[PDB]
Nucleic acid binder design. Sequence first.
RNA 1: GCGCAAGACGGACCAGAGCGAAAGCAUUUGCCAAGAAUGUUUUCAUUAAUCAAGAACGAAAGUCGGAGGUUCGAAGACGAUCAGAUACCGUCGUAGUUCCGACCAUAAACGAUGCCGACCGGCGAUGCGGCGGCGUUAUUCCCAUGACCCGCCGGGCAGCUUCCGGGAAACCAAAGUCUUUGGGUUCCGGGGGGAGUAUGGUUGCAAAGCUGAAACUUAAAGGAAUUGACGGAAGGGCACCACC
Lengths: 213, 132, 82, 135, 101, 61
Amino acid sequence: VVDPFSKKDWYDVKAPAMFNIRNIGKTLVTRTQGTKIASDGLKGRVFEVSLADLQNDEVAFRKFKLITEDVQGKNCLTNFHGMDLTRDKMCSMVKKWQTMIEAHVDVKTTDGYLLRLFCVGFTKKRNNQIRKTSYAQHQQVRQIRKKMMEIMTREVQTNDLKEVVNKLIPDSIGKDIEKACQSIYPLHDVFVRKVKMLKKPKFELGKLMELHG
Amino acid sequence: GRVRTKTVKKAARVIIEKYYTRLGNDFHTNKRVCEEIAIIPSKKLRNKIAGYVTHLMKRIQRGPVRGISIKLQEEERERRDNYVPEVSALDQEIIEVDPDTKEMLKLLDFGSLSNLQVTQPTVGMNFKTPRG
Amino acid sequence: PLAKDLLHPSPEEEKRKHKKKRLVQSPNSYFMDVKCPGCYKITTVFSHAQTVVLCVGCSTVLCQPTGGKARLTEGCSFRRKQ
Amino acid sequence: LGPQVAEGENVFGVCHIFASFNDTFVHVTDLSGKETICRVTGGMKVKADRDESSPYAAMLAAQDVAQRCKELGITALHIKLRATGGNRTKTPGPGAQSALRALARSGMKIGRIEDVTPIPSDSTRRKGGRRGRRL
Amino acid sequence: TKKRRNNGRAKKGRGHVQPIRCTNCARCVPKDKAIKKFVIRNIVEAAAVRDISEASVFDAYVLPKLYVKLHYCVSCAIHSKVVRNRSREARKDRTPPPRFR
Amino acid sequence: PIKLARVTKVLGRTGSQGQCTQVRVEFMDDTSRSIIRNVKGPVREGDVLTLLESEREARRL
RNA sequence: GCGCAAGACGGACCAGAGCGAAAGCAUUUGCCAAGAAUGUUUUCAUUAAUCAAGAACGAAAGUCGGAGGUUCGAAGACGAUCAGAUACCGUCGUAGUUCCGACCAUAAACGAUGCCGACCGGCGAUGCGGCGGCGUUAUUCCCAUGACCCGCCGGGCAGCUUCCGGGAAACCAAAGUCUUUGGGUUCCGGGGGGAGUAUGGUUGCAAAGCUGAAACUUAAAGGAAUUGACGGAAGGGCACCACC
Ligand SMILES: [Zn+2]
């Protein structure tokens, strides 16, 4: 008999300052009723917004899970949580007559943010290759995976989550993987397909202020 | 529908092949000559032979037809087949050989031929179709 | 077919075949004569050689072994024996 | 009541069109995924268990759901079409494009199109027998 | 007598090939006996390709696709008319049909 | 609402007993919407159809 | 929508591709001990082939003991279809399906095709190793290696093809080299039933496994292929003695 959407109030989810688009949308939460507080209700909210909504001229087939953790009175400040490729680019990549090279590490940032850098790569049929398939032998796909876990541990352990997501916007990791690993087997379309988030140290308020500027 | 059986088409084909000079485009003067050439049991077959003939005479202006053979085309094809050009297409002053062709001619002691102009061989060994 | 000459195969027809499937078994290997540039000695090395062949004087490598043919090191030139 | 913004800007909710053959769902939700709005299924329109997944049953499932959020001022939607997946069929139900077309003809706008259906790396045992659905 | 030369299968020189289900019947047919089919169609049917584009807040927004791989059984493929019976001499011709139009 | 239409080209005659002609239908609002519909009755090219629900799709019954 | 756990399973990449004695085997990483093929102007110098007896491994199911039980699930209970269903269909669901210690030793365990050896047509691909060669990429340019491209050699799983020859044919480059019959060697069949039954011995906790008759009973059982006919198999086509 009562509309529950009268007691709901809106908030502006504000992205961090690593991008060009700062405000990304709205959210809904009920008001506080004394026993519970609406900041706790809006605490565990993830936001799987794509990259074309955060930067203008970039690609669109990448995603970014964004947990919000600060509310500032009609201002919801969010933090980077995870990364993912869209499920159309993934199934577009996987053809038949080539190999898929998978890799993952549990790499650690300098502030303590235990990430998990998944990876994926595919071999490249040449320009004049009459031959039908292009697979790779087992020590070749073990040496590509060896050079993958090298670079996605030496590009993360030297930094914290400031510079890692600046590298993740043009995806410099894959553009270094293929450029480093042409000399083993030519990789074709190599990305980081997922970034998870294993465990986080306790939140400090002034640090997220630096991430929004 | 209106399909002409083997009797109409066989009779029309022979009467074109033997009497092409008298037949033209008018169905009526075709009927008046198809009843003076041939002995057809009468009209409803006579007008069907003369109609396929009137459809078959229009088909001869646009070229030959794969059945009958008439001697106004088969003299023009004969004068088209006895056609030699003035200077032949095999009289070329600069003919192009490969490197390896010149080696075969040197095996046949024809390395002293002057008209041969050896081309640069192809840089890539790329000739097979891309299987898959 | 049906009139070859088995007594007299052509010299390219001999070299195509397996070394045991020729008319008489000929080996496919040789003894080279490697000259290390940093030294002045002469050490006779088998072509399809196994574990490494060191010079006696300079005590450096000459050829590390491979699958079929032992590859020489850099600067090591060789002139084939007869 | 609604987002206090100018109407030239387009706000965003996300709909999760769970298309199956038992019925078709339309579950609009905010961008968080937590506080949802309204869930107008395909089965709520016609009272027939045979017609619970018809392409007309999603024509009317995405006409009423375009009135509750237009009541709250939502103008552009995010679309996550989902077949039942898992071990069952990973091909979408027939009442999916009709529920998109009824959402795109009711004045509402679209955002992203994305296919999140549950596909496993590998899963448990299928429902049927070894010899299968003998029918 | 032997109707097929490869026994209706692609097993040539191994002992056991793994069993997978059927998509419709859910019947355990071996992996090189399932009729396979790869579909690349648009996620929204082509009648609603204009009306998805007028409601686009993005400009020249691309259309995502469905990529499922279908392993039909042998019994229910011929029932579903995806594969058929051919002649005794058309049986030996394993070329794919002319889909390119 | 009700929408008035036109006929571009008749496609083929479907149905259980061949009672339905299937027709490629243009609208009259200068629209580029060439919908396909199921019409029962005698149709030639250049008719003026009248639909009640102008968003339905052509199936085969 | 955020988490937590539990056990199961390792897609797409996955091929008429790879390895394995056969059953059989796909996520990362390390460790441990094996192997084929190739290369060799190493070594021993007949040490070999096939095999009674005897022996190792043996999918699935099942039986003794513990551990765990996510899905699925014999038996069982319900609901429906049905003239009738004690079945197909749908919902629950014990033993089982998973882990380890014993047993069991069978399958459409199949290529329905014993192993070793020689000779006998082509063609294009493919996997692994070796050798030779234009010319393109990367390791900044050079060498070497990788990725290709063009061949050659060896051994593999296969394919197409053919008046090699066989075959009752279907078909087979082996199922050829066979009345022009003899390279070595193991197993094993003798019209159809009774019957893989009865009995005896042996193995096993049992379930069962191995070995294995006769009395009687029959004039056919059967293999390939042809021509119809039939189909609740498809593709097409037609008829107001069909429909709309
Ligand atoms: Zn099936």
